[PDB]
Amino acid sequence: GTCVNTNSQITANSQCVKSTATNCYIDNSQLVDTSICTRSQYSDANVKKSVTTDCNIDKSQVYLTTCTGSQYNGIYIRSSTTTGTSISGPGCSISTCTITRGVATPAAACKISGCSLSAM
């Protein structure tokens, strides 16, 4: 029981290991590898070594990513940082980007494909 749970609803079909979830709604998802969940809703998602605050993550996999006030729906995102943005697209894939309110900061390492970026 390596999950530091603070007022979080974590389903049985969910899993929280070596991580912290404060006021989080985790359903059929995994919050693993030193991840930090705060007031975020995880739906059929995988959150690894990531931090999400007031985020709605649905059918997505987030790695080494920090999420603040954002929505992910059916996307894969890594080594990134998004704030106040809605990201969707069945085949959305983002890697090493900084995104604030729907606009991705131009960068060489930032790789984005099959995604729809908008503000929240």
Automatic annotation (TrEMBL):
It holds the Pfam family CfAFP. Coiled coil: none annotated. Disulfide bonds join 3-16, 24-37, 55-67, 92-115, 97-110. InterPro entries: Antifreeze_CF, Antifreeze_sf. Keywords: Signal. Transmembrane segments: none annotated. This is Antifreeze protein isoform 501. It comes from Choristoneura fumiferana.
